[PDB]
Amino acid sequence: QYDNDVTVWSPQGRIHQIEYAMEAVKQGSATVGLKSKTHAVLVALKRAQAAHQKKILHVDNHIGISIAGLTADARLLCNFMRQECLDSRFVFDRPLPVSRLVSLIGSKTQIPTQRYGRRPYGVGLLIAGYDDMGPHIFQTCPSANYFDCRAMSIGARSQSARTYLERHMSEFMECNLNELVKHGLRALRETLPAEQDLTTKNVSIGIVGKDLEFTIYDDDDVSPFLEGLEE
């Protein structure tokens, strides 16, 4: 049996434990993030089940995250990032960029995939930030592989949002802030069983840009972005 351990390649070059971990991301509440020419947005769902846990965090004035896996292991990576940024500010006196941070995070996660008695982190992450070269959206998976995309989403039944975005891809880079918010919220709306509509007690949204340091909005400040819906 090649399934019970993480140091056993299968006859077809497949480490089953990493796939079994990946299967933990396609069960949590969905999350979405897209990029513009000047700002970056992130949203969530907060599936209450009658209270539930939050789904967005703060890393630093110019970097924030959205999690879709095991909440216990996510705080670990969050702490790692906070400490790395604090160190870069203490030594060099400069905000750490996003690319080097995501590379560090990727290296941190490759080790347990190569030895005994360890397990891979079962959490996927969406990262939003801003630096000299503009905004940046990054994706992270259990396997130590990170991408750089214009728009992505993760969770259950996230295929519909992906299709809607691939169809609306050639519309960003010029929309305003609230237009981006509406686009994202109406893209997320498809990951529901055609029996519920987005409300204030479900949606949580974070926003970062060249003029604002990753502000988050709670259930009581999301209403302004709900007007302008359809069926």
Partner: protein
């Protein structure tokens, strides 16, 4: 055989999914909050008419403003409670203020999935704790209640039951809640719920009751401060 940090073909760890089934064997506990304090009630589950019931401590004090009820394995809990206390005091040592219930629950949860054979294991931790906790206390922003599982995913709530029969009782507790409900009605409702769910009887000895209402500190009900309300 298998290991302790091994996944299943569902994204679910194994030891945790197995331990959660242990709490289905423990006794029941109920925790409620309101606008003027919280309430915690618990069951004892006596076995013989020779055990000293005053020795069963299921509702302990973390500090003057925090509490805790526990279910599952009463043993594995003794390692966490202390930790909490310690943390709190250290806070007061460095900042001269009181710790939040969110902070306490987070610090406790950070110690849940620390287990494995790779490390030298000076802490010797080899498996997860089978317990379910229910905190409660006053803070800088009104009273708070929380819930913790053996996986470290604490989430705030308004009224929650845990234990063996914490499946149908949650429904009854879901019906009888209004934001403007007071403390007395909550206490009576929890008591009648425990009566309908309990098997033997409802005496002022087979229960523990506690409150953290603002202005006052943690309090445990006496044998005489209880029966005066059971006369319904």
């Amino acid at each position: 055989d298998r290991g302790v940090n091994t996944f299943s073909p569902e994204g679910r760890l194994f030891q945790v999914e197995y331990d959660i089934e242990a709490i289905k064997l423990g006794s029941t506990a109920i925790g409620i909050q309101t606008s003027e304090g919280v309430c915690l009630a618990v069951e004892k589950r006596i076995t013989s008419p020779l055990m000293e019931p005053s020795s069963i401590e299921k509702i302990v004090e973390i500090d003057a403003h925090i509490g805790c009820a526990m279910s599952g394995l009463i043993a594995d809990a003794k390692t966490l409670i202390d930790k909490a206390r310690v943390e709190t005091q250290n806070h007061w040592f460095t900042y001269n203020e009181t710790m939040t219930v969110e902070s306490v629950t987070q610090a406790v949860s950070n110690l849940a999935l620390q287990f494995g054979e790779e490390d030298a294991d000076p802490g010797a931790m080899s498996r997860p704790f089978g317990v379910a906790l229910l905190f409660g206390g006053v803070d800088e922003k009104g009273p708070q209640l929380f819930h913790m599982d053996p996986s470290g995913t604490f989430v705030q709530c308004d009224a929650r039951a845990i234990g063996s029969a914490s499946e149908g009782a949650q429904s009854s507790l879901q019906e009888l809640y209004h934001k403007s409900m007071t403390l007395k009605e909550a206490i009576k409702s929890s008591l009648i719920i425990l009566k309908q769910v309990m098997e033997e009887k409802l005496n002022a000895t087979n229960i523990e009751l506690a409150t953290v209402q603002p202005g006052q500190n943690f309090h445990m009900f006496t044998k005489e401060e209880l029966e005066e309300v059971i006369k319904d």
